Amino acid sequence: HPNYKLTYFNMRGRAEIIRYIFAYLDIQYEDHRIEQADWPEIKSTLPFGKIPILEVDGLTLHQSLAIARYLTKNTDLAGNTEMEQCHVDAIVDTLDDFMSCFPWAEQDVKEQMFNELLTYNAPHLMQDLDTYLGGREWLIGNSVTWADFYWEICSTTLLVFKPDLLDNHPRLVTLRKKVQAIPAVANWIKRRPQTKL
Amino acid sequence: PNYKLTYFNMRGRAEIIRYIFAYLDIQYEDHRIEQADWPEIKSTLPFGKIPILEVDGLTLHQSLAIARYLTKNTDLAGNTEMEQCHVDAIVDTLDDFMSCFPWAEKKQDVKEQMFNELLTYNAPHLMQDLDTYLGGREWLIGNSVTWADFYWEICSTTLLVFKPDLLDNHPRLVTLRKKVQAIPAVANWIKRRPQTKL
Ligand SMILES: O=C(NCCN1CCOCC1)c1ccc(-c2c(CO)ccc3ccccc23)cc1
Numbered sequence: 001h002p003n004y005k006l007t008y009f010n011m012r013g014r015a016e017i018i019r020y021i022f023a024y025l026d027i028q029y030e031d032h033r034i035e036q037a038d039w040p041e042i043k044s045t046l047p048f049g050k051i052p053i054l055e056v057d058g059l060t061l062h063q064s065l066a067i068a069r070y071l072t073k074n075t076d077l078a079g080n081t082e083m084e085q086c087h088v089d090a091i092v093d094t095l096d097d098f099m100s101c102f103p104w105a106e107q108d109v110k111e112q113m114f115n116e117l118l119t120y121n122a123p124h125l126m127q128d129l130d131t132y133l134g135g136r137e138w139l140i141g142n143s144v145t146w147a148d149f150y151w152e153i154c155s156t157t158l159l160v161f162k163p164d165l166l167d168n169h170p171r172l173v174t175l176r177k178k179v180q181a182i183p184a185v186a187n188w189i190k191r192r193p194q195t196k197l
Numbered sequence: 198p199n200y201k202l203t204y205f206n207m208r209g210r211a212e213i214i215r216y217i218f219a220y221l222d223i224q225y226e227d228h229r230i231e232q233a234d235w236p237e238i239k240s241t242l243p244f245g246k247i248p249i250l251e252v253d254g255l256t257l258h259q260s261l262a263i264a265r266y267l268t269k270n271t272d273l274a275g276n277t278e279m280e281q282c283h284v285d286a287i288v289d290t291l292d293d294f295m296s297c298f299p300w301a302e303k304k305q306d307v308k309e310q311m312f313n314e315l316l317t318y319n320a321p322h323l324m325q326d327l328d329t330y331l332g333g334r335e336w337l338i339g340n341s342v343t344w345a346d347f348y349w350e351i352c353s354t355t356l357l358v359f360k361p362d363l364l365d366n367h368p369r370l371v372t373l374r375k376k377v378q379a380i381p382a383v384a385n386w387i388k389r390r391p392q393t394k395l
């Protein structure tokens with residue numbers, strides 16, 4: 001059981017998937033939340049200059065989904081078979097692709113691009129996700145995976161900007177609530193720092 | 198298995214899969230779609246995107262998800278779980294950057310401005326970070342080739358089309374490209390594959 005230090009901004013953002021996994025697996029970690037003012041110094045010490053990073057016994061890992069996958073290796077969150085693991089990885093990247101389209105660090109052009117993505121593109125993605133879910137209980141297989149975690153995390157952020165995101169997708173709302181009801185996840189959701197994003 | 202890869206007639210996002218099939222000597226159907234058939238075929242895809250890989254009647258999607266699946270339990274995977282994390286991280290860092298480019302932008306002046314900005318400002322920083330990460334070592338992760346090395350060669354090949362001087366101050370990254378290109382199965386694929394710009 002190694003020493004884990006997670007470094008990110010004071011927000012859910014790209015660190016939250018790692019935080020859900022730690023909560024579910026009951027893994028102790030330091031939730032290091034930096035202020036924007038401390039970032040220049042920290043940024044200059046990192047191999048690839050981006051966060052989140054996870055220090056594992058002092059060894060710096062980067063890329064939130066690479067880290068998430070590493071932490072879920074040989075756990076019940078990974079997918080029950082090699083093929084299920086592929087399906088999990090694919091859903092995660094499909095979600096991450098969409099979230100990465102938003103110009104988070106871009107006013108005017110930023111506001112325009114956000115409205116276009118939320119209004120013209122998000123509903124299409126929600127439909128494809130609902131279709132993929134196909135009336136089943138979880139996105140992949142017969143039990144929860146970190147793809148379901150990431151679905152709940154990404155949709156929570158999208159709902160902040162688009163409250164009607166899932167008005168045509170009650171089954172996707174049901175999946176969100178199912179993830180949110182998992183005791184370890186429910187406990188983290190009620191206890192985590194309250195931030196907008 | 199009966200593998201059928203569907204993608205455009207481009208290296209693009211399918212090429213990492215094509216390299217892995219070649220290296221592992223796995224037969225597959227390299228199906229390249231017609232541009233006139235794209236509007237029709239798009240509605241059949243699980244998320245409206247390509248590449249997809251069909252495996253015995255089952256459809257898979259997402260190029261790196263597929264690449265990771267195909268390299269599981271092979272010598273192209275990281276040797277340890279932490280190495281596998283390093284491979285995944287390098288691949289996502291490359292993929293993040295390539296995905297920033299407005300490949301489908303119709304407005305030519307906007308496209309050229311964005312390409313130039315990414316290539317002249319952002320790209321050099323990435324090359325610097327990759328070179329320092331590599332150091333004096335033989336491959337990006339561990340002591341043998343991984344699919345992270347493949348993806349480096351694939352992405353840099355395309356970047357060099359738009360910025361030929363990209364690696365002028367990074368001879369170690371050039372050497373890495375040549376090492377990947379010197380692998381027999383990869384070299385054979387490179388000489389036999391369709392010659393496309395992207
Ligand atoms: O141009 C690209 N894609 C769209 C093709 N259009 C579709 C509509 O009809 C006309 C053709 C494209 C795709 C992939 C890439 C790409 C390359 C190109 O060799 C290499 C690495 C990548 C890594 C990540 C993402 C894209 C890439 C560049 C451009």
Ligand SMILES: N[C@@H](CCC(=O)N[C@@H](CS)C(=O)NCC(=O)O)C(=O)O
Nearest residue numbers: 013014049050051052063064065293
């Ligand atoms: N795909 C990467 C993205 C990393 C990334 O761009 N992180 C942002 C924060 S959300 C960042 O480091 N921005 C500050 C900066 O680039 O200086 C991941 O998921 O870890």
Ligand SMILES: N[C@@H](CCC(=O)N[C@@H](CS)C(=O)NCC(=O)O)C(=O)O
Nearest residue numbers: 097209210245246247248259260261
């Ligand atoms: N992250 C995904 C991205 C897939 C993707 O956006 N593919 C492009 C072609 S390079 C596509 O299908 N776009 C055409 C469209 O959206 O109509 C992957 O690597 O598979």
Ligand SMILES: [Mg+2]
Nearest residue numbers: 093096289292
């Ligand atoms: Mg990605």
